[PDB]
Design a protein around this nucleic acid. Structure first.
Lengths: 65, 83, 167, 141
RNA sequence: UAUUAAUCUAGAGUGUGGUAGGGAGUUUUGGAAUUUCAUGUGGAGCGGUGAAAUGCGUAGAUAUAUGAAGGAACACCAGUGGCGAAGGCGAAAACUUAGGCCAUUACUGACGCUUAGGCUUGAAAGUGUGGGGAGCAAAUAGGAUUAGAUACCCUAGUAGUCCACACCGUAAACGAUAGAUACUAGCUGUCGGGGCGAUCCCCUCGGUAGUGAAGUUAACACAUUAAGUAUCUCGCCUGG
RNA sequence: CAAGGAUAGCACCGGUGAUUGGAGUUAAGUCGUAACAAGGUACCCCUACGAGAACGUGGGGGUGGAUCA
């Protein structure tokens, strides 16, 4: 699960945290639900919005490779 | 958060106020003007409309109760400024 | 207000010219300035857009009029020198605090214990610790107390007792 | 001695007291607290003198200007409540007024009635002795 | 009980700090889809239900790849989750705005309930206007079982659709449950904060599914996430 | 100034009809059994289009539904 919940910051943003993203993201470029990611609920929405931005940012593909 | 510290600290009805009738209604009308400008800029915002009606009617009943409650503690903001 | 911007430059190109054109794009901000000259180096796009197999990553952190970043979102995204203009502010789900910083001892502790790297300790990364003391610092308490004690009569042994000696 | 979540200003003290008493009878509660009310003090005192009520104490917080009042709904040590039921005759929306000529017994005369007549609260039975009527607030037994 | 001067602040919020959320009006791009058009290929088929046919293809269809493009909306992100006036809220980003939640030993001095009247929005279908129509699509045209297949099956296919103005006003709009006040066992957990505390376990308050005793009930069953108990008002039903 | 009174556009109430729609009312007439089976189509509400109709049908909403942990 995320280091952010283990340190305390109550938010995350795309500072190229791709490493931990690869733990939350399957190699299929699809966002696993809250169960796999391990966030509580708040860092869950934070990583959700970050992954969606990365989709928009082209950091992560939607499905196209 | 348009105004939170301006009118409730620069205006003291009694010896000291952190929340009262007239400071609340003055801040309420400031936010009323802000929200009316916002909805004139963006006409399809109805949550603001309902909030404004609630705010103005709560102010009206505030003044109504303060009529009898205190001799005269309301003659600073009983009007409206939207024309 | 506070504004961190993640930049996606168009396709594969030189680092310095892209930095200069990104500075020119930051100039589209009327007064959102005070940038710190830095970048994220080279990072390629994981997927081809339609011919763009790679790009370059730049970060711009500064502050200014919040209304005047929408025009940047227009110009950067339209002009063929930035593809994505990622903005950071409070409207995006926020949690930041300038006084929650004294929690990075937990950061060091979790970096140590995100995975136990010693053969002796191989505990799961999701197991309790329990030095527990249970701090609250938030109760909404009221100190109610008795000053007049009349009618001395109390109810403490309210559990039933019945059915004496039976033959 | 408040139970939890100190009671705010209800629409009327008697209704909040009735809720507290019914909840005490239902969910195995013994001591209940209510907002400060002089009529509450009077009715608690007269119920104590009637024998159906246990200790009652006025309560103050860090300050003395605000007040509340707690009382043990009289329970014997075998889990039985002294008060078995209540009814209000006068209501906030309809304060029914019954003069001295309008004071009958309580459902056989076994129960106790209370009237807010001139000053404080008087039982309808003793109010009939002083040829006193008034607005009857509650029937209890 | 309406109350006077003062009032008491325990509420309404509000001074303040922390504060989470798909809340929302507003404005931006990105992913690609889709089918085409310039491009060439290539040999022989496509359509489909229970089976086929209607319906398409050598004058090059399938399929093809990049270039370019129209409308159009954003796989996942989606939870003992949260935010929600209802209707709802998720490719993102931000302007703005709203609602909070936790705590403030605090203030006007309780300054608030329902709602005649007035105000507001209102899923969605559809409508005149101007434009667009990518895509499917009723009605159905044709065809398959059929005693009938009109409903259910397949293709061709337009109204419709779609963008905005104006009109939409209803839904099984529900929580089959209008609210507001005050109060009432718990528990597995979990969520937002105050958090001591790698995260934790552990709680404080509000929330989120269930739970079962009182209580409730025609029974369903609800039960401190009442169909529990009392206070105030608007809507309704008196057998079909 | 009076009871009573007319010329020309209106105004109020009562009744009525060529014909026509719906409601109740015929053991038994007549299209299929749409729906009750998940009535074979899970169903229903709003709304839109048509078949002689059940009804479907386009979109949205809902559980008052099934194997089932």
């Amino acid at each position: 699960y995320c280091r952010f919940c283990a340190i305390g910051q109550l938010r995350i943003d795309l500072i190229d945290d791709l490493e931990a993203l690869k733990r939350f993201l399957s190699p299929y470029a699809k966002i696993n639900p809250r169960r796999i990611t391990g966030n509580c609920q708040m860092h869950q929405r934070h990583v959700a919005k970050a992954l969606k931005r990365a989709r928009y940012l082209a950091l992560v593909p939607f499905v196209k490779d | 958060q348009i105004d939170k510290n301006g009118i409730i600290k620069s205006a003291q009805l009694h010896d000291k106020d952190v929340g009262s009738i007239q400071v609340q209604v003055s801040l309420l009308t400031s936010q009323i003007k802000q929200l009316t400008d916002h909805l004139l800029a963006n006409k399809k915002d109805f949550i603001s409309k309902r909030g404004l009606y609630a705010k103005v009617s709560k102010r009206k009943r505030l003044l109504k109760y303060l009529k009898h409650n205190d001799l005269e503690a309301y003659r600073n903001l009983v009007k409206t400024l939207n024309l | 207000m506070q504004y961190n911007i993640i930049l996606l430059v168009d396709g594969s190109l030189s680092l310095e010219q892209a930095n200069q054109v990104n500075e020119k794009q930051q100039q589209t901000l009327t007064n959102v300035e005070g940038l710190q000259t830095e970048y994220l180096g080279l990072k390629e796009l994981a997927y081809p857009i339609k011919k763009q197999l790679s790009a370059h990553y730049y970060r711009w952190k500064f502050s200014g009029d919040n209304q005047s970043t929408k025009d940047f979102k227009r110009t950067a995204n339209i002009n063929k020198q930035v593809l994505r203009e990622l903005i950071i502010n409070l409207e995006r789900e926020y949690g930041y605090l300038a006084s929650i910083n004294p929690k990075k001892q937990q950061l060091a502790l979790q970096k140590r214990a995100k995975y136990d790297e010693i053969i002796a300790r191989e505990n799961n990364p999701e197991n309790p610790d329990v030095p527990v003391t249970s701090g609250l610092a938030s109760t909404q308490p009221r100190l109610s107390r008795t000053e007049k004690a009349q009618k001395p009569k109390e109810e403490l042994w309210d559990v039933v007792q019945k059915m004496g000696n039976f033959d | 001695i408040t139970t939890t979540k100190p009671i705010k200003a209800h629409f009327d003290p008697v209704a909040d007291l009735l809720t507290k008493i019914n909840n005490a009878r239902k969910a195995k509660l013994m001591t209940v607290t209510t907002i400060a009310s002089k009529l509450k003090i009077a009715i608690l005192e007269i119920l104590v003198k009637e024998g159906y009520l246990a200790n009652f104490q006025v309560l103050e917080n860090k300050s003395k200007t605000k007040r509340i009042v707690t009382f043990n709904l009289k329970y014997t040590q075998r889990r039985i409540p002294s008060i078995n039921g209540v009814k209000q005759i006068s209501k906030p929306g309809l304060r029914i007024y019954r003069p001295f000529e309008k004071l009958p017994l309580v459902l056989n005369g076994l129960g106790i009635a209370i009237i807010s007549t001139s000053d404080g609260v008087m039982t309808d039975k003793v109010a009939r002795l002083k040829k006193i009527g008034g607005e009857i607030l509650a029937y209890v037994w």
